[PDB]
Scaffold this active site. Structure first.
Site, PDB file in Angstrom:
ATOM      1  N   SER A  85      40.791  44.771  46.641  1.00  0.00           N
ATOM      2  CA  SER A  85      42.030  43.682  47.046  1.00  0.00           C
ATOM      3  C   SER A  85      43.282  43.887  46.312  1.00  0.00           C
ATOM      4  O   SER A  85      44.289  43.509  46.836  1.00  0.00           O
ATOM      5  CB  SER A  85      41.512  42.247  46.848  1.00  0.00           C
ATOM      6  OG  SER A  85      42.541  41.333  46.522  1.00  0.00           O
ATOM      7  N   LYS A  87      48.652  40.002  40.548  1.00  0.00           N
ATOM      8  CA  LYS A  87      47.959  39.985  41.827  1.00  0.00           C
ATOM      9  C   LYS A  87      48.207  38.613  42.455  1.00  0.00           C
ATOM     10  O   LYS A  87      48.163  37.592  41.761  1.00  0.00           O
ATOM     11  CB  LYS A  87      46.467  40.242  41.606  1.00  0.00           C
ATOM     12  CG  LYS A  87      45.649  40.337  42.877  1.00  0.00           C
ATOM     13  CD  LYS A  87      44.198  40.696  42.578  1.00  0.00           C
ATOM     14  CE  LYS A  87      43.380  40.703  43.863  1.00  0.00           C
ATOM     15  NZ  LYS A  87      42.019  41.302  43.697  1.00  0.00           N
ATOM     16  N   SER A 133      37.388  45.512  43.398  1.00  0.00           N
ATOM     17  CA  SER A 133      38.806  45.271  43.674  1.00  0.00           C
ATOM     18  C   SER A 133      39.835  45.762  42.645  1.00  0.00           C
ATOM     19  O   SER A 133      41.023  45.868  42.960  1.00  0.00           O
ATOM     20  CB  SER A 133      39.007  43.778  43.942  1.00  0.00           C
ATOM     21  OG  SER A 133      38.011  43.298  44.835  1.00  0.00           O
TER      22      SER A 133
END
EC number: 3.5.1.4
Length: 508
Positions: A170, A95, A194
């Site tokens: 996210s 990420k 997320s």
């Protein structure tokens, strides 16, 4: 030598505190502040000599439109493992809010873009030490403040199941790449869901471990008490395996208690779940904002566990609804206070900091503030109101209520081994048009975190597994358990996948 403030800066500082400077004061403060900064000069020198991370030279590339169909990749790389291990021969996407030394990162924001970290996050080092190859950085929402996938400054991440729909957010990029088969697994972050939200939307597995189990060291902080890092994979077994590699104290993360120890997530992963008590959290279904087909599907899925010897009963947890509001106060007041005013890391916590990142983000944050997503602005505005006018009291009240929210779940966990409910109240919706209404933007960006967010504040381990398809799109069931009982959560998840059978790939 540390930069000194000029006279207007000094005056501005005084105004901030309601301090009025006399003509005589305006003259004395400069030299007094200069003397005080003598200590900063020393720290600057000591740091340059004793704690400056070594240089790193790694290769990276920006994918062409072809090689990046879902806009899920920020940059691609091929960082080799430092040792062979349980992950040998596997690729992992990281990420974009997690640092990989020598590789640029922007955390999906114009305010961070242009930054190349000097340290590897602890999880990255462990992954490479376990034989994994780091395949690249996966796009994430603008400063990770969005439950959808349309806030990244680099463009909306597309769901591989339907490129006109949201991948979730996210960690949208991570989930997309995993579901699309570009990588074996990925590291995601979870502050309000997320990790679980995109896994659900894209039909893959996402596990938010017990708070403090996995070191957050090296990831961009949002609100210290709710930051989690965890795996996003195609199967539960892979999630357990990745967790066996990244779990554990690293001595640099203040979130990790002294007693934290990695459990055994593989030994009994495939053990029988006969006799396990499963609680269906009523408050997790029938929300005003939701699609009843999704709720029924998940509900049916939860009950099908009786077929393998599980006792399935419904349970009421009123605090599940209150927990959402408590989370909101903490993420808003806390987020603005730490992520914005504190430049990501904030202060007042022992641990490993990234001074370079703080400085970079600080200079770009004000210069590109208008480019920030509407959700981040909402947090900035109402959070600023909570911190100043409200004196932070609301945050203090929320904090004093967390033990009660935590105790509510633990009481249910005394009657059941795990609690289940829909990860999301609806299936991936179509991306908004670049003309979206600010109000629509906010509701569509944060209206699906009602079931996930509560566990970010209480810290319970929470797993999202593909439960089935509704209108051809993935829906997920969320399994939550006692702190540090990630093994049981994973086991129940593994048992469910076996009963449910192989889950279809969007490539079908």
């Amino acid at each position: 030598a540390t930069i000194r403030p000029d006279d207007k800066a000094i005056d501005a500082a005084a105004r901030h505190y309601g301090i009025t400077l006399d003509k005589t004061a305006r003259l004395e403060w400069p030299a007094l502040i200069d003397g005080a900064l003598g200590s900063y000069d020393v720290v600057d020198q000591l740091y340059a000599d004793e704690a400056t991370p070594p240089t790193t030279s790694r290769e990276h590339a920006v994918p062409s439109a072809s090689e990046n169909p879902l806009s899920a990749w920020y940059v691609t790389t091929s960082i080799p493992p430092t040792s062979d291990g349980v992950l040998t021969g596997r690729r992992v996407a990281i990420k974009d809010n997690v640092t990989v030394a020598g590789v640029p990162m922007m955390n999906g924001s114009r305010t961070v873009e242009g930054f190349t970290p000097s340290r590897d996050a602890t999880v990255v080092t462990r992954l490479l030490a376990a034989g994994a190859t780091v395949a690249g950085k996966a796009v994430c929402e603008d400063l990770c403040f969005s439950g959808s996938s349309f806030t990244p400054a680099s463009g909306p991440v597309r769901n591989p199941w339907d490129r006109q729909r949201e991948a979730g957010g996210s960690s949208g990029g991570s989930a997309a790449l995993v579901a699309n088969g570009d990588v074996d697994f990925a590291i995601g972050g979870d502050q309000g869901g997320s990790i679980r939200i995109p896994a659900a939307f894209c039909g893959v597995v996402g596990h938010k471990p017990t708070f403090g189990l996995v070191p957050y060291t090296g990831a961009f902080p949002i609100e210290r008490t709710i930051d989690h890092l965890g795996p996003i994979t195609r199967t539960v077994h892979d999630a357990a395996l990745m967790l066996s590699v990244i779990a554990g104290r690293d001595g640099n993360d203040p979130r990790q208690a002294d007693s934290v120890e990695a459990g055994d997530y593989l030994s009994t992963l495939d053990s029988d779940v006969d006799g396990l008590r499963i609680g269906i959290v009523r408050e997790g279904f029938g929300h005003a904002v939701s699609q009843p087909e999704v709720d029924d599907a998940v509900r049916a899925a939860a009950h099908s566990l009786t077929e393998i010897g599980c006792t399935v009963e419904e349970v009421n947890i009123p605090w599940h609804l209150h927990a959402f509001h408590i989370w909101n106060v903490i993420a808003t007041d806390g987020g603005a206070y730490q992520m914005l005013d504190g430049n990501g890391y904030g202060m007042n916590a022992e641990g490993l900091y990234d001074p370079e990142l703080m400085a970079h983000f600080a200079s770009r944050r004000i210069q590109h503030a208008d480019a920030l997503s509407e959700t981040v602005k909402l947090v900035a505005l109402t959070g600023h109101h909570g911190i100043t006018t409200l004196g932070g009291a609301s945050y203090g009240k929320a904090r004093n209520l967390v033990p009660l929210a935590r105790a509510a779940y633990d009481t249910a966990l005394r009657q059941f081994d795990v609690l289940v409910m829909p990860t999301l109240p609806y299936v991936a919706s179509e991306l908004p048009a670049k003309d979206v209404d600010r109000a629509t933007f906010i509701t569509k960006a944060l209206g699906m975190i009602a079931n996930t967010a509560p566990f970010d504040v209480t810290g319970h381990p929470s797993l999202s597994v593909p439960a089935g398809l509704v209108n051809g799109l993935p829906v997920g069931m969320m399994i939550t358990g006692r702190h540090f009982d990630d093994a049981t959560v994973l086991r129940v998840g593994r048992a469910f996948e076996k009963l449910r059978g192989a889950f279809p790939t969007p490539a079908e």
